Amino acid sequence: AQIDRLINGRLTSLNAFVAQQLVRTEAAARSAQLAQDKVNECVKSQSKR
Amino acid sequence: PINSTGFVVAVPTNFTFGVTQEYIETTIQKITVDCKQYVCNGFKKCEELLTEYGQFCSKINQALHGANLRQDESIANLFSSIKTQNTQPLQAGLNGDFNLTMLQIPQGERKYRSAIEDLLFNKVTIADPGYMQGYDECMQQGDLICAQYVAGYKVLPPLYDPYMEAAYTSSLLGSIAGASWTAGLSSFAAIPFAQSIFYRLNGVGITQQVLSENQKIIANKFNQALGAMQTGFTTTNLAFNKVQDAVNANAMALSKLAAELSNTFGAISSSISDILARLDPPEQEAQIDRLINGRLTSLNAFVAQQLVRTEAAARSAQLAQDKVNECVKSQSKRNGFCGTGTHIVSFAINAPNGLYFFHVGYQPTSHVNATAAYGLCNTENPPKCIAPIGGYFVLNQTTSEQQWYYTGSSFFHPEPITEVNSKYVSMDVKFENLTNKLPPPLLSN
Amino acid sequence: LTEYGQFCSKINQALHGANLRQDESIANLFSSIKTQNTQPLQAGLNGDF
Amino acid sequence: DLICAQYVAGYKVLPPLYDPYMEAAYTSSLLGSIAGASWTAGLSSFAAIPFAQSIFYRLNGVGITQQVLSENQKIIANKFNQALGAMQTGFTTT
Amino acid sequence: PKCIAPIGGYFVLNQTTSEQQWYYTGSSFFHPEPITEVNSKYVS
Amino acid sequence: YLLNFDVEGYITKAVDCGYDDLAQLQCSYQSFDVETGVYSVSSFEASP
Amino acid sequence: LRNQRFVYDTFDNLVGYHSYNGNYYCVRPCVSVPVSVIYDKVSNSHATLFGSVACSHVTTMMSQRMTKTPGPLQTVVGCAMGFINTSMVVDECQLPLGQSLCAIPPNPVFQIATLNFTSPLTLA
Numbered sequence A: 001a002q003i004d005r006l007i008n009g010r011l012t013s014l015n016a017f018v019a020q021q022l023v024r025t026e027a028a029a030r031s032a033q034l035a036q037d038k039v040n041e042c043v044k045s046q047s048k049r
Numbered sequence B: 001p002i003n004s005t006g007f008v009v010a011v012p013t014n015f016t017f018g019v020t021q022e023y024i025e026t027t028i029q030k031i032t033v034d035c036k037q038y039v040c041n042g043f044k045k046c047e048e049l050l051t052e053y054g055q056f057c058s059k060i061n062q063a064l065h066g067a068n069l070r071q072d073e074s075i076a077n078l079f080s081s082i083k084t085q086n087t088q089p090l091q092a093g094l095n096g097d098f099n100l101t102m103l104q105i106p107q108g109e110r111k112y113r114s115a116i117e118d119l120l121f122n123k124v125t126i127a128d129p130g131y132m133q134g135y136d137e138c139m140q141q142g143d144l145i146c147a148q149y150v151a152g153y154k155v156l157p158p159l160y161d162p163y164m165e166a167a168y169t170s171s172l173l174g175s176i177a178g179a180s181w182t183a184g185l186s187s188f189a190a191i192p193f194a195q196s197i198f199y200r201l202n203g204v205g206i207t208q209q210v211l212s213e214n215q216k217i218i219a220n221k222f223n224q225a226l227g228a229m230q231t232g233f234t235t236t237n238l239a240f241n242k243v244q245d246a247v248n249a250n251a252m253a254l255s256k257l258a259a260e261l262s263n264t265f266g267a268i269s270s271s272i273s274d275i276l277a278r279l280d281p282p283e284q285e286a287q288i289d290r291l292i293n294g295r296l297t298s299l300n301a302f303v304a305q306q307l308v309r310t311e312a313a314a315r316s317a318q319l320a321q322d323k324v325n326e327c328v329k330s331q332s333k334r335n336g337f338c339g340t341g342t343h344i345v346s347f348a349i350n351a352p353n354g355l356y357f358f359h360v361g362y363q364p365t366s367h368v369n370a371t372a373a374y375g376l377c378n379t380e381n382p383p384k385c386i387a388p389i390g391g392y393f394v395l396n397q398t399t400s401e402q403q404w405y406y407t408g409s410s411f412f413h414p415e416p417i418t419e420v421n422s423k424y425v426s427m428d429v430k431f432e433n434l435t436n437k438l439p440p441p442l443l444s445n
Numbered sequence C: 001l002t003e004y005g006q007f008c009s010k011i012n013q014a015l016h017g018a019n020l021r022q023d024e025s026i027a028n029l030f031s032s033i034k035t036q037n038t039q040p041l042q043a044g045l046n047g048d049f
Numbered sequence D: 001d002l003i004c005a006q007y008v009a010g011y012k013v014l015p016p017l018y019d020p021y022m023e024a025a026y027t028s029s030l031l032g033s034i035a036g037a038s039w040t041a042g043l044s045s046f047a048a049i050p051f052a053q054s055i056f057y058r059l060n061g062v063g064i065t066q067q068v069l070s071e072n073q074k075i076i077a078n079k080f081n082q083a084l085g086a087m088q089t090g091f092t093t094t
Numbered sequence E: 001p002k003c004i005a006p007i008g009g010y011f012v013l014n015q016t017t018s019e020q021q022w023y024y025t026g027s028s029f030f031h032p033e034p035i036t037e038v039n040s041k042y043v044s
Numbered sequence F: 001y002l003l004n005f006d007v008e009g010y011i012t013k014a015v016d017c018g019y020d021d022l023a024q025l026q027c028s029y030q031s032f033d034v035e036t037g038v039y040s041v042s043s044f045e046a047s048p
Numbered sequence G: 001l002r003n004q005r006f007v008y009d010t011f012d013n014l015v016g017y018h019s020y021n022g023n024y025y026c027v028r029p030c031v032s033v034p035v036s037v038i039y040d041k042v043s044n045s046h047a048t049l050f051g052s053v054a055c056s057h058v059t060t061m062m063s064q065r066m067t068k069t070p071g072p073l074q075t076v077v078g079c080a081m082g083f084i085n086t087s088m089v090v091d092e093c094q095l096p097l098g099q100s101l102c103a104i105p106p107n108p109v110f111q112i113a114t115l116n117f118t119s120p121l122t123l124a
């Protein structure tokens, strides 16, 4: 019973870690798209915006 | 760069039309949960214990209801432009020499998908949610879809049916052709598709003489580029992979929801019927309480994840609206935003959970190194100086007094320098000083 | 833990999917090296710059 | 500590897809795509105009006339060099 | 030949319905006006 | 039952939650006043 | 295998049974039909939609408190109660039901209408 407490707690905690990593990965992909836009607009040309 | 006066520029001598493909999500699958059925599976003894947790189930239901409402508003906002978009009817098949058959709805009950949309949907495996009569079909027993009625969650139908989606993508196809030289957005010119394409090509630096000499060649290259989209949906392409990923995220949400009902949470069983059969009060109620608490915490996690996904999809739908407005309903001058190479025209079709774009670009294949001048001046006492408009001043070679010509910046074809392709500018020490063979704009007589 | 066998595999597979998606996103950003024309610069001063 | 805890706790930091030499290749590709023409419509041609001339074309396009630019060449270059040199000392808490 | 194209507008006939009398209008409001060097440019 | 208490403490009105689908919606929201909408409610009971 | 008598799935739930009468039976846990409620505050009236259910099963299940004047109506999203089929057409509505359907509340029974959007100007 004591070991089962640790098993259940650690599995729930890993589920939370996985959800957080999914969120962060999606955000980073969006930010990479923004970086590509900035390169194309400000580095490879002159901006009028 | 060259050490001499002027500069060297690589100017295309041949070209092809390139297609860049891009997928943009606009929705997720909408899910509602009957909390009491999910937690207690219809056993009266469990339900009696759950009444001490009555507030939490209602909060779960209300959160899901709010999220689905917000998605309905977002999707309504995207489709609303059908009511304000002027359109011009196209011709079936060939428009001029351009073959648009794959993108049009063929002309019993009317169809709601073009040929290319049919090819895309046939390569994706999507389960049928059975909006009309799926309950009876699942009664005819013989998985995630039929698990709705066991676990106590329901897939809700989307706001619009496929005929409205076809109406939207036909509205997009009818808003491509039009004028190019006008300032505002208030007028609507009924210029046929082929003429519109030739205006778009002239604006990125291909002169009128070149276009008149290469009409059929250009149409054939365009038709070749359109015809190859049919055979491309595959594992290699990133956009198609994104389509499959959207579908898989939808399926994984449901599968994780159903799998959690097999978690014992440290009880003797995950089945309430077994617990009632094997134990007696008060040990019985403690075991059931373990399942109640575990399942409520799991539902809280599911609700949080769905909120996050819904917000992300609404942002992505805004991006899709921006792409439609910038790349489909006009020609883009932005480097890299509407495909690769110089943007000519874009088309949009329906796809699972969003929109699928084909960005058609002008892509050179061979170049020549041309010798160019920053500008040209005469030797009058006050000098007169000219600079090219939308092109280059070049010598007629593919390798003193020199004979200077003009070419458009997107295709090497030397032409005489006239007031049509040149303008007067202030003097610059980089400009060539000309004594003989002055072009007419520089002539003092 | 063998009575919780399904949940560990799901955790591992979720993390694998997220890392795969990031690899695709970073590949997309770097790919323009293969299609970008360049001009060599001079070491140090370019004109007076 | 957190690095050595990988092998105790049972998690692993995976290496990134590209090594630093590929990142340097990317940022050198960016530095080699700045100089070029300004007055042309499309994106299909590539002119090998030196960096200084490109800068002076960019200045002329935001409203500084040719006479001003010819009279102030060295001053403009010195101001540019001063602005570049101060990035070195800026990375800070502010 | 010498050829012209409109600047920020259209070359139109003065009708709301051979040799024809062509005018210029701005693209956002119909008001035919004489064609001059202010509203036209030379083209190929 | 859904019970409404006035300031003095008396019960002035009530809703029988199991009478019809609208009564169930009201009991789920713990309110006599619900907004216009389309709502999912408790499924039809299946007992052996 | 008939001689093993019980068929199970990957979660160790019973899904089939070989009877001594010679027949095989698929087994499923007890299921519940979805219910949705359409409510208009202004008129204080309501109607119901059983999503994914054909009208016959709901007609039978009621015999098994008020749910148990127009008859049930079949739509592309399930069986509807308290609604009259209206060949009506709208371009906006308050109570969508999915698949381009929505409910028209009674001006103080519900009406079912479809959503159809039209282009403003077509120029040949």
Ligand SMILES: *[C@@H]1O[C@H](CO)[C@@H](O[C@@H]2O[C@H](CO)[C@@H](O[C@@H]3O[C@H](CO[C@H]4O[C@H](CO)[C@@H](O)[C@H](O[C@H]5O[C@H](CO)[C@@H](O)[C@H](O)[C@@H]5O[C@H]5O[C@H](CO)[C@@H](O)[C@H](O)[C@@H]5O)[C@@H]4O)[C@@H](O)[C@H](O[C@H]4O[C@H](CO)[C@@H](O)[C@H](O)[C@@H]4O[C@@H]4O[C@H](CO)[C@@H](O)[C@H](O)[C@H]4NC(C)=O)[C@@H]3O)[C@H](O)[C@H]2NC(C)=O)[C@H](O)[C@H]1NC(C)=O
Pocket (backbone or CB within 6 Å): B108, B109, B110, B111, B112, B128, B130, B131, B132, B161, B162, B163, B164, G076, G099, G100, G101, G114, G115, G116
């Ligand atoms: C104003 O707006 C309204 C609302 O938009 C418009 O009303 C709609 O008008 C259309 C066109 O008339 C109606 O479409 C017909 O609907 C029939 C009934 O469909 C239901 O029942 C089906 C079973 O009987 C069921 O399969 C179907 O649901 C599936 O399909 C829909 C999409 O149609 C999906 O949304 C569902 O999820 C579901 O999908 C699953 O099955 C699909 C099919 O296998 C898969 O593709 C999918 O992936 C899923 O797996 C729904 O519940 C339907 O029978 C009609 O079908 C015929 O026509 C279509 C389109 O051409 C063909 O694809 C079919 O094969 C079939 O073809 C032939 O039809 C003729 C004539 O009936 C027949 O003689 C011939 O024998 C058939 N032969 C063949 C080859 O099969 C058709 O889809 C739609 O129901 C209306 N919606 C309403 C009333 O709410 C209205 O017109 C607008 N007004 C104006 C003026 O514009």
Ligand SMILES: *[C@@H]1O[C@H](CO)[C@@H](O[C@@H]2O[C@H](CO)[C@@H](O)[C@H](O)[C@H]2NC(C)=O)[C@H](O)[C@H]1NC(C)=O
Pocket (backbone or CB within 6 Å): B013, B014, B015, B365
């Ligand atoms: C532009 O490129 C195309 C494709 O390479 C060239 O077309 C081919 O030309 C060769 C002869 O040089 C023929 O044998 C092939 O059959 C052509 N392929 C086709 C038509 O698809 C075309 O000649 C090039 N144009 C130039 C160089 O001006």
Ligand SMILES: *[C@@H]1O[C@H](CO)[C@@H](O[C@@H]2O[C@H](CO)[C@@H](O)[C@H](O)[C@H]2NC(C)=O)[C@H](O)[C@H]1NC(C)=O
Pocket (backbone or CB within 6 Å): B093, B094, B099, B100, B101, B102, B115, B227
């Ligand atoms: C335009 O292209 C389409 C294909 O994209 C051509 O249609 C195909 O033609 C072949 C040969 O006749 C048929 O086997 C296919 O079934 C057709 N596909 C369809 C109809 O989707 C079409 O003929 C082309 N049009 C012209 C005039 O070139």
Ligand SMILES: *[C@@H]1O[C@H](CO)[C@@H](O[C@@H]2O[C@H](CO)[C@@H](O)[C@H](O)[C@H]2NC(C)=O)[C@H](O)[C@H]1NC(C)=O
Pocket (backbone or CB within 6 Å): B396, B405, B414, B415, B416
């Ligand atoms: C530019 O140079 C080319 C040759 O490199 C000229 O092309 C020739 O023009 C004559 C006269 O029209 C033709 O008979 C030849 O067949 C052309 N040769 C080729 C390879 O095309 C071209 O006319 C020159 N353009 C000018 C002077 O404006």
Ligand SMILES: *[C@@H]1O[C@H](CO)[C@@H](O[C@@H]2O[C@H](CO)[C@@H](O)[C@H](O)[C@H]2NC(C)=O)[C@H](O)[C@H]1NC(C)=O
Pocket (backbone or CB within 6 Å): B005, B428, B429, B430, B431, B432, B433
């Ligand atoms: C064209 O001729 C003018 C002189 O009429 C040249 O101008 C001189 O250019 C040098 C730099 O090359 C300056 O140092 C002189 O001050 C300029 N003189 C004047 C009067 O402005 C010009 O460089 C020539 N352009 C060429 C050969 O490309």
Ligand SMILES: *[C@@H]1O[C@H](CO)[C@@H](O[C@@H]2O[C@H](CO)[C@@H](O)[C@H](O)[C@H]2NC(C)=O)[C@H](O)[C@H]1NC(C)=O
Pocket (backbone or CB within 6 Å): E014, E023, E032, E033, E034
């Ligand atoms: C274009 O046509 C309209 C008529 O359709 C002309 O309008 C008339 O112009 C005369 C002279 O100014 C006025 O007396 C009338 O009252 C006008 N009628 C209307 C209905 O406004 C207009 O002048 C023409 N424009 C030209 C020739 O440039």
Ligand SMILES: *[C@@H]1O[C@H](CO)[C@@H](O[C@@H]2O[C@H](CO)[C@@H](O)[C@H](O)[C@H]2NC(C)=O)[C@H](O)[C@H]1NC(C)=O
Pocket (backbone or CB within 6 Å): G074, G075, G085, G086, G087, G112
């Ligand atoms: C509302 O009533 C109309 C008839 O007045 C129904 O439309 C018919 O539906 C059948 C079956 O799909 C078609 O074969 C007929 O052609 C349709 N007639 C017309 C005029 O469209 C319609 O389906 C009804 N709507 C419901 C029951 O929700």
Ligand SMILES: *[C@@H]1O[C@H](CO)[C@@H](O)[C@H](O)[C@H]1NC(C)=O
Pocket (backbone or CB within 6 Å): G122, G123, G124
């Ligand atoms: C213009 O033409 C369209 C048909 O192309 C017609 O529907 C419309 O009523 C016409 N408008 C006027 C002002 O006559």
